[PDB]
RNA sequence: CGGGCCCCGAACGGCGGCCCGACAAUAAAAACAAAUGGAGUAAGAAUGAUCAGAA
């Protein structure tokens, strides 16, 4: 399981791309992906905000990234 | 400064315009986005790096048959997202619509069927007009502001066409076309940039092939910059250079003070 | 999976323009790049990943058969 | 799985850093973390209301804490 | 498992009039009748079943201490 | 999976023909009598046989109280 | 009613069912959405209907930008 | 006008309604009868009020 | 139209019921209606002050009278 | 129509010193010089034109009898 | 109603108007109509008829 | 007829787009610009597109003479 | 009843030595919003500051002498929240809010802006951020009572010899314009000016005996309340307490009662 | 049941045809702590070269 998630997420983390996360209700977050697991993600932004997976809708990076 | 320049050019075939030097003129002519219309070329033809201008991102949605229609769109910086669909057989099957997304603004290249060709073209134009006003009634709900680069092939008012008494037979100034266009600019709230900046006549955007009409300026303002009522106040200036014309239509450049991102 | 996997694979084959609708009611245009058990890749300008639990329906822009 | 959530929440609770939870509906909360477990969390505030994990959207600590 | 069951059992035993707020924002009231791994029965005038996946949080009307 | 309250409660509400009022997560009020239920679906009998999903239901509000086993 | 600029405004507020914030002269605020209107009354649907009178409405501030 | 349907519906169902006056004082009581000029509340005292000083009529129950 | 306030006020006047007209400003006006007409009612105060309808708000009788 | 006009005409003819109170409650004084369907002229040191829509009541300082 | 205000305007009498909210307005009458009274005092402070309570001229007319 | 003087004044204020400050009968000052008007309504464009009823408007004070 | 006290102590310690604790204990009130604690929350934890029959709530700035605000309530509030997301707010705990049924009050303390130019810049920053937050606080159902010292006067009626203070901070044009926009445009009101439109009422005057003699007061305290509660204003008073606090206590009552 | 729509009488009434009463879909809002006081409150233009006011 998650054969496609982990590569994409760890690539985004390595490149430290400023990604914009859209939640289910519509509000958009911002910050570099610091760390993640199966259910939570950490944003390196000043707030050090943590976001749960089940609440995230889309992960749109600000720049195109290469697939490993 | 916080200037935003939009260039809408109906070329009636990118080949002729490029031959006349539209590509190099645009490359030199600074602009954030170029709403070039009527490509008459497939996406694979637009894929040719000759048309691809450096420092811009090319996006185009051609029709099933290239020469029939086709629309393209340039963008200096990578837009947020590009969509190439409208939901109409008259639109999807003809690639006559291509919209991009930006920060609280939406540049949209629009190309209505001319209709001057044949009666079947007039019927297609009426169909597309009713479908598009329905789409606009549905879109007004959206909060995000929109911009529509569109050559509508319809004269709005008397000032938007010369000798309208004679043109009342030619497709463009017809009663139903006038009604549809004024309803789009009226009840639907959408406005125009040219009419907002300069309420001055003699400003046309289309002329026949005969040089007689060009010299006499017997032309139509078939090109419009339909703006959502929001940016109406943010229209800085507009112009219609008639001399550097590369097709039946004239390049329509409008600069705004709004800054996209 | 039974049917969703064949359908998504068919859509990926022809790169048909699809429209993914989230639960909130918004529509996202593009074409599927790839997918798995929990996420779907919708390539369009940028590679934006979308989660299954947040998707409501996948509507292809044109008629397509299994 | 759930290998990172556990230490993060445990540190937040131990240091009692005041956190501000945000529900999926858009509602905000305040108060320190009392306890946590699977599918449930306890908030340390004027009232110790029980919040479920499946309804939480983000966990923003008042002051950035170290993992 | 470790924290949810004792908390719910104490809430039910003490019969504290709790007001549960659903994730949709609707406000409910009533005493805790019984609970399960998927459902909870809230009794206010007439028994009103509520699902666990639709609750935002549980707000006890009186402070409670875990066992 | 091996619960204890949902099955008997729903079975009683079905047998007694109690006019049940179901609340969706969206906040819409559904009215009707319980026809039959499953691990993931509940059939609401109100002229038309609406197949309401379990995860979409917020609360089940019956019109009258019922005894518990 | 001769020009009826209020009619298009109320019609666009109702058709889109936008969240309105009708302020009254007394000072209280009424949240909800316009369900219907006539000459002297407006229907606000906030769980229950509210028969707010026209002559008592001070200002109507829609929390949602309405294009027109 | 939609005022009369609303008022006569409240009268038929006899729903306890809370009426706010232009000043803001909160009234309570059912509606017995009404016309275009006045309303005849069914309160303990049945205080009559004219229509030129009304703010909002709301039922306590949906 | 105007078929309901006329008989109500006429009955209040006939029986000389003490009404307490609360103005829009929150002022009491205890007295008996001596007469009434368009845009005017006539109190039976010691001075029989003439009031205007547009200013009047409520008309509550101290004793409940029958229609 | 039947009550306001005769009452005001009598107050004017007899020149009774009346005390008018505004809708806000401000107390005014002066004699009724001339009446109007929409306004009145109250001469008190300086003639002030008061609007009818702002008149709460008309208190005559002296009892008056209608014709 | 009309003649009194017309005389107040033409004669240029200093007028002071107390609004229904009690605000003591000051200025000269520029022009008036059924539902509007333009008060000239530095700026064209328009005043509505329905909100006017008293019109206090500085001297009788 | 009714607005022989109100209509021209409001139309001039609109065309010139003079920032006006509307004082309500309640005493609440309302700064902004007149977007449009009619018989009993005036649209005030500001941070929030506001619609103020005429019957509750006490005075309007343009910041500059017109 | 429904009373609210506002005493920007400018140091809870000096307040204690001045007898503020005993005065508040004797002063029967529902909520007390003192500002500028100038001490950490642990210092406020001292039972000496705990008034009998009232709860203790305090949020301290990153640096104690920088500011800090405390809040005392007679009944247990539904919830207490601090901060607003802004650095100028969170880093100094200049905002603390309690939650009660139907109405939730808050304690606001704006920077004086009179010490230096940087203070004025921080004041402008916090003002724009706060008007933005309040724009985000528009359609919100819950009614609020932002009891705080804004360090700004709205109108000349709130301060004499304005001609001399026009250039001095506290009465500058941008601050007054910001306050007017916050009040009028956004429908917010004030209990005092509504219930009593009387001048000469001030709260903050120089400690200098000369100013006290000639009464050089600047009105800096305001009971900013949402328009919902505007109708429930009983009366406002500014006692001329004998130098108990730079900002004289601001006591106001309301017709609307409170509930858990 | 009751709102929106068109249809029809003489700015003013109202009746039939219907639809819906859960938006064939916001490219996304750094976040919706949770949906009667009452007999009545109005301090001073740093100065018209000169104001008679009626049945």
Numbering used by the authors:
A (entry chain K): 4 to 71
B (entry chain Q): -2 to 258
C (entry chain I): 5 to 70
D (entry chain M), I (entry chain Y): 4 to 70
E (entry chain D), J (entry chain S): 5 to 71
F (entry chain E): 3 to 71
G (entry chain W): 3 to 70
H (entry chain X): 6 to 67
Show me the paper's own sentences about this structure:
The estA 118 fragment threads through the assembly and contacts all three Hfq hexamers and all four Crc molecules. Focused refinements resulted in a 4.1 Å resolution reconstruction of a sub‐assembly of the Hfq:estA 118:Crc complex (right inset and EV2E). estA 118 is presented by three Hfq hexamers and adopts partial ARN motif engagement on each Hfq distal side. The Hfq2 rim side residues Arg19 and Arg66 form hydrogen bonds with the exposed N‐site bases C‐28 and U‐25 of estA 118 (counting backward from the AUG start codon, with A annotated as nucleotide 1). Indeed, disruption of the ARN pattern of this Hfq3‐binding site in the estA sequence resulted in a decrease in translation repression of the corresponding reporter gene by an order of magnitude in vivo (Hfq3mut). The proximal side of Hfq2 coordinates an estA118 hairpin‐loop structure (hairpin 1). Indeed, removing the prominent hairpin structure that is recognized by the central Hfq in the estA 118 repressive complex (Hfq2) promotes translational repression in vivo, suggesting a somewhat antagonistic role for such hairpin structures in the assembly pathway.
The widely occurring bacterial RNA chaperone Hfq is a key factor in the post‐transcriptional control of hundreds of genes in Pseudomonas aeruginosa. Here, we describe cryo‐EM structures of higher order assemblies formed by Hfq and its partner protein Crc on control regions of different P. aeruginosa target mRNAs. Our results show that these assemblies have mRNA‐specific quaternary architectures resulting from the combination of multivalent protein–protein interfaces and recognition of patterns in the RNA sequence.
